[PDB]
Amino acid sequence: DTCGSGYNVDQRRTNSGCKAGNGDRHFCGCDRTGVVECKGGKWTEVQDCGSSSCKGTSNGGATC
Known part of the structure; x- marks a missing residue:
């Protein structure tokens, strides 16, 4: 699921x-941790980013 509004x-x-079909795409959790x-x-x-630092794109590529 996406995280919502x-x-x-x-x-x-x-x-x-x-x-x-998501394959190995990386996304951020809702709290970005x-x-x-x-x-x-x-x-x-x-x-685990620990702090709320995760960022990525609508196509994946997330990193802490």
């Missing part, structure tokens, strides 16, 4: 469902 196109809700990737059908945190 007030959130940006580079964000996906950690632990929510995700389509397999982590980078997520679609694994096993769920947005899964692959890097």
